[PDB]
Amino acid sequence: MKEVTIEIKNKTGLHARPAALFVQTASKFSSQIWVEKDNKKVNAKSIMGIMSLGVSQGNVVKLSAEGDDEEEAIKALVDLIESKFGE
């Protein structure tokens, strides 16, 4: 298992384009991947789950992954978030 805590910086939080790209990026990896905010946890490859989570700008989330590529799956998401989704 690999886990990281990270702040969401972009205006939209995990909604619309960023959310789609987030799931897109997570879906590149074989690991099971999760996104947690305040005790609620969802599959990072699930757009309905991401939506349910209601992650807005400034929110700190925990990303976790378990699988053969868990470390680089998390890194890919960390990098996507820190770059504000390619901005």
What 3-state class would DSSP assign to 82? Answer: helix
Split into its structural domains, the chain has a count of 1
Which DSSP category does 58 fall into?
T
Technique used? X-ray
Domain of residue 83 covers 1-87
How would DSSP label each residue in 40-82?
A: EEEETT-HHHHHHH---TT-EEEEEEESTTHHHHHHHHHHHHH
Asked whether 35 and 53 are in contact (CB, 8 A), the reply is yes
State the catalytic residues: 15
Task: Find the CATH number of the domain harbouring 70.
Answer: 3.30.1340.10
